[PDB]
Structures are given as structure tokens and as C-alpha cells.
Write an enzyme that holds these catalytic residues in place. Structure first.
Site, short mmCIF file in Angstrom:
data_model
loop_
_atom_site.label_atom_id
_atom_site.label_comp_id
_atom_site.label_asym_id
_atom_site.label_seq_id
_atom_site.Cartn_x
_atom_site.Cartn_y
_atom_site.Cartn_z
CG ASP B 396 -5.03 -80.86 -48.33
OD1 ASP B 396 -5.32 -81.35 -49.44
OD2 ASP B 396 -4.62 -79.70 -48.17
CD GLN B 398 -11.90 -78.10 -48.12
OE1 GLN B 398 -11.84 -78.29 -46.91
NE2 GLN B 398 -12.39 -76.98 -48.64
CE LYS B 428 -6.27 -36.97 -40.00
NZ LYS B 428 -5.61 -38.24 -40.35
NE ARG B 436 -2.84 -32.08 -42.04
CZ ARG B 436 -2.79 -33.28 -42.62
NH1 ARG B 436 -1.63 -33.84 -42.92
NH2 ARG B 436 -3.92 -33.91 -42.90
CG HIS B 513 -8.13 -34.53 -42.45
ND1 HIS B 513 -8.74 -35.07 -43.57
CD2 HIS B 513 -6.84 -34.94 -42.49
CE1 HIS B 513 -7.86 -35.77 -44.26
NE2 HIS B 513 -6.69 -35.70 -43.62
CG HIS B 520 -1.90 -41.40 -46.82
ND1 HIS B 520 -2.52 -40.17 -46.71
CD2 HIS B 520 -2.01 -41.76 -48.11
CE1 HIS B 520 -2.98 -39.81 -47.89
NE2 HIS B 520 -2.68 -40.77 -48.76
CG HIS B 594 1.16 -36.52 -42.06
ND1 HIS B 594 0.41 -36.57 -40.91
CD2 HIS B 594 0.30 -36.75 -43.08
CE1 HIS B 594 -0.85 -36.81 -41.21
NE2 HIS B 594 -0.94 -36.92 -42.54
NA NA Z 1 -3.30 -76.94 -51.15
#
Ligand code: NA
Ligand code: NA
Ligand code: NA
Lengths: 639, 639, 639, 29
Positions: B396, B398, B428, B436, B513, B520, B594
Site C-alpha cells: 500500500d 502508507q 435527568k 435515586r 443530580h 457513567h 442507579h
Molecule cells: Na499497515
């Protein structure tokens, strides 16, 4: 009012227009590309000695660019970006064609499973378990043509022209990069004025052909047409050159960046040695070298590569690398001592430039600048007072986490780097295409062996005089002599004779892309600028103080722990971020793959990329705050 | 042709239009906000029991929302985003006004340096070295209104409505989150079918009021109006509920995500236990737990928090947290053993949900997904075959580093997270505002003490029956009894009586919050989707194999090293990325902050954010490749 | 053709586009804002010593910024421009809060009719007829955010960064502003080379602790790190600093502007002393000092304030002003002599800097530049030859009054000023926020009393050395000693001790807005540029000549009449307009409220505002003429 | 938000339009 869809689209169009309506500069090279020539049958063609030719066919006997048509095809491919145009470009060793002006014929191909015979160096001949080294191609040549959604465009920002072979500037720079190769195993405590604290020698004793005292004299005395880079007044220099210009070399300012706070304290930035205090109840201190990576730790100890073991010290080793021989991971590393904990000395504290060269060898982009970001957050570092919800929770009745807390800066240090690489990739590949310092060490040697045709290497003549008249080369040949006594290259034909080749800390040497515009420094400049913007740049680091002197950290004799250094003034966030920017950026220069110009101008290019992103993202928030980001060239700006 | 300035502007306008021309969904809540009411003098007002009220004034005697006007002002502030409107919202403890309908008066203010007297819990009273805990405010409430330069807009993407207090779904979820609190010190080897390998007990012996066998029965038996969540057929459920629905609880599928490859192998993803082989010459193996962070290492050992030490187990401790008492960093951690290396057991391998809860407690955004990204790169993981310059360098001509190498993916895992947080921040704060799980544990207790006014807590009545009829609560009170014998809360008035409060692994409990939309999981979903897109998702991890079985890793009895587990089939990149996505996302659920719904729907929201960015950035490149990104809901998509 | 409505709209759209398509520069401060810090409990915060804090709460005991949170709220308010955000900012004296990081509590409020007890100085305590001084707030902070219909936008033009406390430039400037306070009663004939004509002393004899001869030596000798501002070569200085740089201090060039023609002739511009010849039949001459205000006259005699009576010479007087005590109009003025005509000496000719300070104290914007405009028109001054209908009435058959006569220029001098104030208001409030020279005199004193905490005033240390090593401060304390013997401040506790405070000619001192960017100089630069553009700038003023020398005017011993001065060359319109620009601009510096940098860079900012308006208004006229407006930085431009 | 350059240009275009959209009377001698 407007529907949120429209407001969201308008802001993205406003950011796009703001980016376009800024000053789009014109890209000016030093015209070295087609200036220096050599002879052909009944005419003359360009030598491309001052251009990056690493990977292309180099003449196996003279170590010069075999065919100029290869470079013309290489250049063509860069500008097009067409995958097909890359495939036509010949790579590694090749045979010059029978008709002149035609493209060279590539010796190695897809049916060459055994490639021992093609290489002339022992290391490369038995690199891939006896099969022989493989070809490696150029890295993201067409990245300069890639656009982006945020920040300034890659071609909407530029770097000034690279210094020339005739110039006093380059002569001082190659001498600086040469010196660093001979000073590669010096203990870091030596790279600072001795008044700060007791200096030490690297526990591992290496044969040294150059000391600090000598290196400062050489760098101060080195001159072209009776002009020294550090001595020359403003009147003589150009507006572009007046900017880069450094003062007379001092024990404190030697091999250091010109960013504010680089001079203050030791060489190595704290964020490369210190960690955080243990999460919750402190089991260890900051001098431990464990970064507070949330609930896990980061080890600040780099892999220890076997000291005073540089590569490409002879012609064969140099030629094969320059003929795109893939030698990655052939460098050896010190084994661990079973008796000692924490995999010592296999993993030790960054004690010498070698260990910095090793850190920087696999640095993995923005690691250093994220690590520094993590260290500050864990320490309890304050953000720029302009940022919303920064006051006591009771008073303001909001904290800010998602957009004005740790989360926002964590992404920003990482964000900027990608845009940085594309911006500099253009300056490297599509504009300047400056040769690697390893290549210049090549040009210096070949001239001293009277290689090339006619007045081909005459341009370099002026450069080698100053290097010999300071007495540097005489020490490089002595250093190389001892390096070629190693069994891996002892039997190489060139080992017997003299070699003026700049030692490379990596077997493969420089990465497969041109020198000018540093990928590390562009990321460094961009990522650090974002940190300086977000954090309180002035914030004096509370590392503690003893005997009415603010304590700092540098490594001990074997890098088993940190040796405390006591300064009159405390270290600021700005200075240490600028120092780690410079450390990593110059870290390449120690490895011998970059010049100072590659660092300095990349750091300036880096901040332009970073500032541009911040400017554009300010359209989003409706809080209307101010981020005061300090620049490397004096005063601060208000985003 | 066009000038690059125009082309660069056009692409940024095209990306902006593409983002706008996609489906902009309408945000639908479960109408719980103003549905459940309570009594006022000559009328009725909403109770806001099912809404997030953490930080607002809660009645110090009943532990219910003191004034509904406070919530109406809190809501008002969210939608405006005006800093001034935040300041009017009362915080922590307050006194109900003499005129009804008026805003509550805040007890704590800027002149309260000593805040011991305001709190009713011992821990909070002597939190800040005897001064007393401080107020903490809500985190980035106005982040939902923040725009972005790339990816979909925060309000251009939505999550389905949160389940209700009357529902069978929630009853199963609160039971699952409750169970995890009592199973918080179980060794991870227990969370899988025992046929795979030998299971072990946590070396640290804790009083257990619930085992795995019991928890599966409870989760399978728990039912509302004679309907169990896992048992209920498709016909009964809504199109939204049919998607979330899980099968009958198995030893293998217990507390695990529904993302493909979560079931296969142990509970904990490899990328949370394993590291890389030592750089260069191997001094250690992958079982070591050192990630190949370029030239430095990452320690996979989490800080060990003192086992079976949960907080907010009584009314006072719970109330003060719910009255925004800042209790961050009051959790204790096990001290190191001088005799042992690598700061053991102070820092140990993630052996129990507690240790995951601790990891996740300070996770610092995208760390887990960058670490996983770093591990794969060091291993020698292949990128998606669509990506340019992926073939041999010779063929290729590259390699690709800047835009199709490590550098591009390193920035992308970090990039996506910021856009993720803003997107969910809206869901939220501005839409769902789900309480919660700690608050529901609050509602359960107060009902069982006959607290509140009239038919205020009648909505919860149905929920507590199923929890008691499975016999779960009887074990929670027993667990809480032993927890309230601790000297820190022994003298608290509520300690003497029964407590049905869900134990919190953190003293402060949930972040300031609302519950619905996990910060997460949104980051997890977004970051993992980017990794799956870039890498070859199918790539079977070469961790080695023994006895014709592909080896895996789970922790040993004390988390001193990794215990190998031998499976019939090898682990794929896709599955382990989906498993670490689920691990961190559910990691919160173990801490008790959670529900499953918060994880599952955030993971789906997360990929929409991530895919949107990738779609928009494809306009930049002219290579014209294809990135095949697999989804969590079956088949893959082609970007 | 087009309908006039369309043509009129097109021109206003074309002017709007022309304004936008010009270079919009980026605003760079000197980063002093958050650089210099001081200590807080377990950390460090910025001191804001180098920032404008006048009006905010200053510690009553130390005279430093009481709370940094106040400045952060002050800054916040500036950028928002919200009236509500101004109201939250505490003003004057305040009490530091019990919780740290919280906003200060304001002592004075709306129910404080009697405010004697709050102030610590006698003058302020009995200011408002025994009631006590009132609070005064900041002046047009949100004017930088105000747009305009013509000229460049306020944020579409910028000033270079203010010099720093460490710099040699500032040290020379504060010494220059200090010197002027001690030379405030010098007769103007002294401020020029004595070869031109006989000099004289001010008839009113004041105690002088400094003379001209001494002041030139001090300004030439004053140096930092062995570098003097006037001595330093170009090579050392930055491109921005190279522009401001002045030559070695001469009797002729002392306290004078660097605008062309400022050096030629006496200090004071003619347009501040001379008038016009009486309308019709001459009853008096130009030496009379009556400007030809159409059919009425303008009196060129300023109100005479009682000589050698400076204010804020002790800590109490200084502190109360810095605590926003409104002391406007408490300065005393000399009573008239019944025997003498024209209310002499109550109203006298501007004889001393004091009288210039007094003129400038109430100057009322553009008065000085309109007066100068009126004087030229009455004299018979020619307009720029490019302007239409300028030739004999018979030949051209049109005169031009409405648009190319007196009327057009009369409005233009007045027009420009408003746009000027808004432009600089941004540079003051939103960017540089440089402290007032009175504040630096404050910082100098407090350091010499060892006030502040830790290394807070260390930045100033370097500055006070040079001021003491030249022997200037020793004379300032002596001057202050005599000033504190005055009964109004004799009993003030600080009067007994030494005071290094720079004397203020006004009781209130500087106006309530930051130092950098002068409101007088910005108007001066803008208004004068318009006059220079319109009039024939070269036109040699025909004031007459005697003995083959062109006569000029400066005041006599008591300012009862004008004393003629005979020069070799005649005075030009350009030079005298540049001199009155400088006179008024530096007039503030004499009062001690500005530096030279505030003048010079404002004069350059001023012309950019003025030129921009002229450029835009040229679209209206179809005559197609040329206005050649000369610049202060050499050559002229063609509008 | 918009960049100040755009806001400043918009206001000058809005002023120009406001002026045009007012009653333009016919001049009768
Ligand atoms: Na390569
Ligand atoms: Na805060
Ligand atoms: Na005329």
C-alpha cells in the site's frame, strides 16, 4: 424564540463562519527543495539533500537519493492524496532504471518472505528472526488534506520557514542535537545551575566524549561567517528569526524551552516525576510517583533501556533505516532485579535524557498532558476564576461537573491533539519537508568521505567546518568508534572506518514523516494551552516547603526515589505545564529526531489550534463567562 | 475546484445540516411528577415523592419534601438555566414559612462557619473536623441547554419514560438494587454458573443476611398484581418495556447487562483485571495487571475500602445526605501491609462489588474505556478492515498514524464522553427527574413507620408488599441492625429502632443530580461504541489457551493475583467492551445509586451520541472508507 | 436607476459590511490578573494588586483587596452587563464573611443617612455637611458591550498589553507620574529648552522637594536589572514596546507627547491660551484669550484651585477614596479680587499643571477640541484642498456650507467622542483592567510599611528599589510630610508616620473605572484626527511675527495675560492639534490618574475609531473627493 | 450565541431596514 434544532444549527454555522473569517496565512518554505542541485548527463537536477527522503530509494554505495523522479512522484502523491499515487512511489532499496528520468524499480515486494539479502547491516539482515527487516511506508501523508468539525483548518494555520544549511541558526541547532546524543546518559540534576542543590552522576557509568561545560562552549563558540546564533544581535536577524532567537547558553537555560517558567527550578517538570497522595487515608505521599487515576494509580517509572547503546552509528545501519527498514522494538531494555519491589530497575524514574527519549518513544499522544491534568485535579488545583459555579455551594447553589468541572478539561486535553496532528501533518508533508537531524548527520559523514557527484554536498561544506572548528565532530567519531565495537554492528564494513553519523537512541530512528513541525510539540502546545486556559495558570503548586524554601523534585542516582530540591520561589501551574510541554517536545531532540525550531514553532502552532477550538465552543454556552489562556509569547488572551 | 477555506466551511455547514435533518424525537416522562399528591389546608398539592428532591429542604421530623414551592422554584431554575434562579432555590435544612405557598427559609448561609447544630446525624455533625458538614448544590443542571460543535444535540435525542412505583418492573429493579447492597462483599467468582471453574469466598468474612441462591428466587418470585417482570410475556408489556425486558434470573445472567457477550465468561471484563506484556523484553505477563501506557504502566489495583461498611443505614444519616450534607471522602480505606510489595492490601485487584463501587466512585469519566483502548493497542489488536492504509507497508506504501492509527481512536474515546454527559443531563434534569434508589429506600422506610400525611405514601404501599412477601425487607432490617451497631451512628436515635433504608456504599450516596439517565452508562455506551466501531469487534482476544480451553481471568481470594478461568470459546473485543460498559454502568447499581433502566437506556442513548459524531466526521475524509459499528440491539451499522 | 429608499438602505448596508470586513484583532492582556498571588488557609489565591479594585471592599487595616470573591463577582458583572449582577458586587467598606470563599457583607446601605462612622479619614467623615461621604459606583462598565450605527465596533479594535510591575517601562512611568505631582505648581515656561525665551516662576511660591533638572536625571537614571526605558536599544524591546519607546529625557521633550509637532514651541498648545479677534471691528486681539463663539465669546481662563494642596497624601485619605468615598467638589478654589476685572484671580490663564489638571478635571468631553475647531474657523483656516466647492465662488459657482463647510466639522469633533468612550470602555473594563497610578502609590507605601501577607507585595519590591535608588521616594515622603500638616488631615493617625502615596490633585482621585485606555486621550485622538483630516494640517498659524521670528504664546507669572515666545519656524495646525491632544491626555497624568502608556496607545486607538467613521461616511457623498488625514505614527492616509 | 462582528453588523442592517420600512412621504410644492 427559536426551536432548539434551529439554535443548535445556527451555532454550528456561526462557529464554521467564525473559523473562516479569521486570518488564513500563506505557507512559505525556505526554497531549499529545488535550490541545491547535482549533475546529470548533459544537464543538472535537484539533489533533494535538504528534503525528507526517508523511505525512498537511497543509492546503496553513496547513501544519496538514488532517483530524483522518485521524490517528484513522492511529492505528487502527497498533494493528490490518491491511494493509487502512493502505490507508484518506490520504497526502500531500488535499482536505477536503464532509461533516465523514469521511475526506479523496487527490489522488495509481496513475494519476498525472506528479505535478509536486500539489507547491508547485520541488525536489519537478522531483524525478523533471520527472515530480514520489512519495508515500512510514510505515516498519514494525506492527513494535511483532512478537514475537521471544530478548531481552525490544517491549511488555515502555518509555521515559518525552516532554517537553511548555509545559516548560523541550523549550525547551532545540529550542534545542540549532536551534543545531546553524547550527553544522552547525563543525570538530569546536571542540566541546571548547581547553586539550587547537590548534583549527582548516573549510577550507570558510560564512556563520555563530551561534558556539559564543553557543550555550552561549543554551542556559544559555533559560528558561520563569524556569526553565532546566540551572539547575533536583532538588527542582523529577520522578524521570523528574531522570534526563535535564544540567549547565550547558561547551565540553567541549556537544552530548555523558551516558554515562561522553563528556566525556574530543575530541568524535568514535576508532572513527569511526582504523583498524587493515596486516595482516602494516605498510605504514601506525592514523592511516591503514583498519579491519582480515580480509584487506580499511574506508575511514573519509565521502562529502562540499556544505557549508552545508540544505533545507526555506522553507514550500513544508517542507510538501511533511510531505506525504510522496519527496526521498531529491536532496542534492548534492562531486566528487573528479583530482590527489589515495583519491577526495579526494569522500571525506574526518568533519570537521564535516554529515559525521556524512551518515555517519548511510546508516549502515546496526550498521555503526559492528561497525567499532568490528573495530578492537578487530585492535588486540589483551582480552575480559572472566570468559569461558572466556582464559589461556595451554599452561596451559588450549583457545583458544575458536566461542563464546568473535571469532566470538561479531561476531554479537552484529549480533543485538541487530533486537530494538532492534522495541522502539522500539512506543514511537514505539503510545505516544508525538512530533512530529519539523522539525515543531516548522514550528509555530514558522506561529505567527509568525499561521496556524491560534483558540487552536490558543497551546501553542507560550510556547516561541517564550524562543527569541526569547535572540535565537536572529533568527539562524535570517538563516541561512534566505541559504539561500533558492539558485536551487532562490529562486522559491518563501515565500523572499521570513521563515522560522523549522529547517534540515534532508536534502531529505526525518526518516524516515517518529515522533520519540520513536531507531532509531539504540536500536541504538547495544543494540550498544555487547554490546561493553562482551564486551570489557574498562576496557582503556586503546594508541594510543601522546608527551611523557608519551597521544595521541588528531581530523580536520585539510580531513579529508585525522588531527590527534593529547595528553591526561593514556589512552582506555578503555568511554568510546569510549559516545562512538560518543552520536556516531551525536546524529548525527541534528545533521541536525535528533531531540532529546536521543530519544537518552538510547533508550540506556537499548537496554541493557535487549541485557542481556535475554545473560541468556537464559546458560542454554545449561554452562561457568558471568560477563560484567560496565557500564551508562550508573553501576555495572556481572554476567550 | 474551490479554495480550501470554502471546502472547510461547506463541510462544517453540511455536518450541521446532517445533524438537524435527522429524527428529532419528543421527550415523554411517566407523568409521576404531578400525579401522586398529598394534603394541604383546604386542598391538595403534589408530594413529589417519585421526583429527585436531594439537596432541597426535607422535613427534619418526617424526612419528606418540606415545601412543594421549593421544587417548583427548583424546576423553574432548571429550564431557565439563569444563575440568579439557582440562588433563589432553598438548599439543605430549612424552616417552613408562616404564609403558605411562599418559599422556605434556608437555615445555613455564608456566616455559618460552625454548622454542627444543623445536622441530626453524628457523622455529619463532626464531619469537617468538628465544624460540621457543609451544603453541596446540584451538578451542571444547565448542561442540558448547552449546545455542541459535533454529534447530535442534547434535546435532539431522548430516553423512554422511567418505570412507575405501581409497576412490576420497578419492584424487580429496587429488589435487584437492594439485593446488591446485601451481596456487596460477595467474591465475583460467585456471579457466574459454577461449571466454568472453582468459585471462592471473599477472604474478608462479613455478616451476610442474603446469599446468591436466595437473591435469584427473590428476583424471580417478586411480583405485583400476580405479575413478575422476568416472567411477564410480550403481549402484556408496552413496546418500550418489551425492549428493556430480561429473561428469568440465572447464576450466569444475574446482575449482568443485556449487551451481546455480557453472559459469556466471568462477570468482570478482562480490561478491568488484565494489563499488557512489559514493553520490549517481557519482565512480566498480562496476568500481572500492568496496562502498557506507552513507556509507563497503569496499576489495575483499586483502593480497598473497609469491607461491610455501608452508610445511610438509619434515618438521621439518610436525612442529612438528602438535606445536601457534603460527606465526600468520609469513607475509610484499608491500610497497607509493610511486609508486602505494590501497596497490598491497601491497593488490591477488584475482587467484590464494593471494590467496583470504589473504582466507579472516582472512575474519572472515560478512564475505564481509555484503559481498555490502551490494552487492545498494546496486545496488537486489529482495526476495522474498512479503514485506509491497513495492508502491508510494502504493498500500500502508507501506514497511517495521525488519522487512521492509535492517535485517532485515543482522542475519540475521550471526545464522545463530554457530548454524552450534556445529552443525559437534559434527560435527568429537564425531563424524567427520577428519584435515586436511596430515596425509594427512604420512601419504603417512612411508609413502614406510618410517616407522611393522609394517602401521601399510598403509591409506595404496593411496592413494599412484594419486597416483604419475598422476605427481602426482613433481611435488610437485620443487615441495617448490625450496621447501626457501629460507634459512628450507634448513638443516633433511629439506630435503636428498625431501618428499611437501602445501604449506600458512599457516605454522601448518589451524586447531586437526578437518577434517570446514568452519567457513567451514557459515557460507557458512547465510548465503547467508538471502540467497537474503530477496532475489529469480532477479534477473539489471544490471552492464550490451556488444555484445549481458551483462558480468561477473574480475581483470587484476597485479590493478590488473577485466577485463570478456562472457557470452550475465546472472548471477543465486542463482548469484553460491552462487559466493561455494563460493569462500570451497573457498578453504580452495586453502590445503590442507579437502577437497571438507568444503565440499559443510557447505553442505547450513548451509542446514538457516538454514532452521530462518527456520521458527521465522515464528511471530512476523502479516502471514502467504511466503519462497521455493531449495536447492543443485535445487527451492526455501516458508517 | 434605483429608488432613493433602496440607495439609502444599500449605502447603510455597505457601510455595515465595510466595517465587518476590516481586521478584527484579538484582545491580549499582560496576564497580571491571575499571575501575582497571596496566601489563603491551606492554599493560595490571586492578590489582584495589579488590577483595578477601586470601589470594592479594601481591608481597613492593611488597605489591600479584602475578599478576592468580590473581584470575581465584579469581573462576572462586567462581562454579563446584567444590572442584577452589578447589585451583587459589594462596594466601599465591608466585613469579611465567617465562611471562606463567600461574598463580603456591605456595611453601608440605603438606611445609612448618617455615614460618618464608616470612614477613617476626617475629610470623608465630615464631607456631606457632617453626615459623612456617600458610596459611589463604577461608571459605564457595560459601555464596552454597547454597539454603534457608524465607526468600528468597540471589540473590533484593541490596545496592546499594559506594562507590568517587574518591567523597566512602568518604573520610568510611575517615576514620571510621581515627579509631575511634586512639579504640579511649576510655571509652564519651565517645561521647554530655555533658548526659546525667558522662563519665569509661579507667582504663588509653594514648598518644592523636586525641580526639573532633578526630575530629568531621575527619569534618565531610574533602571530595573541595569536597564533604563529611555536608554534600552530596540533589540532588547518587543515590537509593541518598540512603538511606545521615547528618547533620552530633554528639557524640551519632558512630560510631552510623541505626536509630530509636540516638541516644537512651548509645552501648552495655543488653542488652550489664545482666542479669536473680536467679531466685526476689532476691540481686542488674539492674545486676549476670547474664542470667537459665533456672536458670543469663550473665556480661556480656567478656575484657579488653591496651589500646593494635593489630597490622599496619607493612608486614611487614600483608603477611603479606594473604598469608593464620593469626595467630588471638596477641592477648594482661590477667591476673586474685587479690584480686578474678569473675575481675577478666581479665573486665571492655565499657568501650571495644577490649572491643566483643573481644566481637565471638568473638561466636559470634546470642549478642548471644539474650542480649537472654533479658533481655526474664526482665524480663517483653510480646509483640506480635496474637499468640494473650495475654489473662488465665481469660478466653481458653489460655496458649500451644509456638508463641506463649518457645519460638517463642528458635528464631527462632537460625533467621534461617544464612539471613542465605548471602544476604550471595553479595553478598560473587559480586557486590561490596569490599576490607577494612585493605587500603585498605595502598593509602594504598604510594602514600605511591611503590610500584606507572605510574598504578596514581592512583585512591587523591584519597583520601589529604583524609585529609592534615584532618591525620588525620599522627596515624596518630605512633600507628603508638609501636606499632612494641613488641619483637614493633621489629626489622621497616618499623618504622624511616613507616607509614600502619590499625591492626588483631586480629593476623589481617579474616576470610578480602570486606568488602561484613557477616556480623555481616546476622545483627544479621535476628535483631533477628525480636525487634522478636515483642515489643512500643514497650515502655518498666522499669529503674526516680530524681529523675523514667528510669535507664539505661553502664560505670564500670575496668568493675568499671555507672554509672547518667538520661534525660528511658524506653528502648523497639525502640531498644535497634536499638542492639545497630548496636553489634555497628559493633563490627567499631572493630576496623577494616568500613565504615558494610557495616553500614547489611546491616541492610536482614538484615530482608528475616527478614521473608521470617515471611511464609512464616504459611501454617502457622490462628489468623489479625497480627505488626507495625517497619523501620529509618521505618514498620512487618503480617505 | 453569535460572534460580536455578526451582532454588530446585524444591528446596523436592522437600523438600515427600520429606517426604510417607515412612511416615505411624497414631496408636494
Ligand atoms: Na499497515
Ligand atoms: Na463550587
Ligand atoms: Na468657496
Amino acid at each position: 424564540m427559536n426551536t432548539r434544532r434551529q439554535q443548535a444549527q445556527n451555532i454550528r454555522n456561526n462557529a464554521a463562519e467564525l473559523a473562516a473569517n479569521r486570518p488564513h496565512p500563506q505557507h512559505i518554505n525556505n526554497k531549499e527543495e529545488y535550490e541545491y542541485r547535482r549533475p546529470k548527463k548533459d544537464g543538472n537536477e535537484p539533489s533533494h539533500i535538504a528534503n525528507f527522503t526517508k523511505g525512498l530509494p537511497h543509492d546503496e554505495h553513496t547513501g544519496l537519493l538514488l532517483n530524483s523522479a522518485d521524490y517528484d512522484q513522492f511529492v505528487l502523491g502527497i498533494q493528490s492524496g490518491d491511494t493509487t499515487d502512493f502505490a507508484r512511489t518506490p520504497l526502500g532499496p531500488a535499482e536505477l532504471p536503464k532509461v533516465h528520468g523514469c521511475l526506479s524499480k523496487q527490489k522488495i515486494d509481496c513475494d519476498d518472505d525472506h528479505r535478509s539479502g536486500f539489507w547491508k547491516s547485520q541488525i536489519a539482515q537478522g531483524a525478523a528472526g533471520g527472515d530480514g527487516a520489512k519495508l515500512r511506508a510514510w505515516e498519514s501523508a494525506g492527513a494535511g488534506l483532512v478537514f475537521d468539525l471544530e478548531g481552525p483548518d490544517a491549511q488555515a494555520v502555518t509555521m515559518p520557514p525552516a532554517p537553511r544549511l548555509e545559516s548560523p541558526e541550523l549550525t547551532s541547532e545540529i550542534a545542540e542535537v549532536y551534543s545531546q546524543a553524547l550527553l544522552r546518559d547525563i543525570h538530569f540534576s546536571q542540566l541546571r545551575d548547581p547553586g539550587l542543590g547537590d548534583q549527582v552522576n548516573a549510577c550507570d557509568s558510560c564512556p563520555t566524549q563530551l561534558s556539559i561545560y564543553e557543550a555550552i562552549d561549543i554551542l556559544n563558540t559555533v559560528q558561520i561567517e563569524g556569526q553565532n546564533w546566540f551572539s547575533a544581535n536583532c538588527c542582523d536577524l529577520t522578524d521570523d528569526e528574531q522570534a526563535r532567537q535564544r540567549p547565550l547558553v547558561t547551565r540553567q537555560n541549556i537544552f530548555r524551552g523558551i516558554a515562561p517558567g522553563d528556566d525556574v527550578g530543575p530541568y524535568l517538570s514535576q508532572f513527569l516525576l511526582i504523583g498524587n497522595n493515596a486516595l482516602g487515608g494516605g498510605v504514601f505521599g506525592q514523592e511516591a510517583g503514583h498519579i491519582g487515576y480515580g480509584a487506580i494509580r499511574i506508575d511514573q517509572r519509565v521502562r529502562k533501556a540499556t544505557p549508552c547503546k545508540d544505533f545507526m552509528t555506522n553507514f550500513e545501519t544508517w542507510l538501511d533505516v533511510q531505506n525504510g527498514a522496519d527496526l521498531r522494538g529491536l532496542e534492548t531494555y534492562v531486566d528487573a532485579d528479583p530482590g527489589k519491589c515495583r519491577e526495579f530497575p526494569a522500571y525506574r524514574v526518568i533519570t537521564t535524557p535516554r529515559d525521556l527519549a524512551t518515555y517519548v518513544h511510546y508516549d502515546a499522544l496526550y498521555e503526559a498532558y492528561l497525567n499532568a491534568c490528573l495530578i492537578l485535579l487530585g492535588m486540589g488545583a483551582p480552575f480559572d476564576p472566570g468559569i461558572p459555579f466556582q464559589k461556595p455551594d451554599v452561596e451559588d447553589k450549583q457545583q458544575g461537573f458536566a461542563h464546568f468541572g473535571g469532566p470538561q478539561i479531561l476531554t479537552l486535553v484529549c480533543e485538541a491533539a487530533t486537530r494538532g496532528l492534522k495541522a502539522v501533518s500539512f506543514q511537514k508533508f505539503n510545505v516544508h519537508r525538512r530533512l530529519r537531524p539523522e539525515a543531516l548527520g548522514g550528509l555530514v559523514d558522506r561529505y567527509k568521505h568525499g561521496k556524491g557527484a560534483g558540487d552536490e554536498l558543497k551546501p553542507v561544506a560550510a556547516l561541517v567546518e564550524a562543527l569541526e572548528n569547535v572540535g565537536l565532530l572529533s568527539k562524535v567519531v570517538a563516541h561512534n568508534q566505541l559504539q561500533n565495537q558492539n558485536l551487532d554492528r562490529s562486522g559491518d564494513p563501515s565500523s572499521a572506518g570513521d563515522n560522523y553519523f549522529l547517534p540515534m537512541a532508536f534502531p529505526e530512528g525518526s518516524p516515517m514523516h518529515p522533520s519540520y513541525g513536531a507531532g509531539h510539540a504540536t500536541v504538547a502546545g495544543a494540550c498544555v494551552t487547554m490546561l493553562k486556559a482551564f486551570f489557574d495558570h498562576g496557582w503556586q503548586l503546594n508541594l510543601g516547603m522546608a527551611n523557608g524554601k519551597y521544595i521541588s523534585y528531581e530523580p536520585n542516582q539510580d531513579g529508585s526515589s525522588l531527590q527534593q530540591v529547595l528553591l526561593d520561589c514556589p512552582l506555578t501551574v503555568e511554568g510546569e505545564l510549559n516545562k512538560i510541554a518543552a520536556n516531551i517536545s525536546i524529548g525527541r531532540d534528545w533521541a536525535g529526531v528533531h531540532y529546536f525550531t521543530d519544537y518552538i514553532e510547533s508550540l506556537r502552532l499548537g496554541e493557535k489550534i487549541a485557542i481556535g477550538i475554545l473560541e468556537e465552543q464559546k458560542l454554545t454556552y449561554g452562561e457568558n463567562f471568560t477563560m484567560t489562556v496565557p500564551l508562550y509569547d508573553g501576555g495572556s488572551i481572554q476567550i
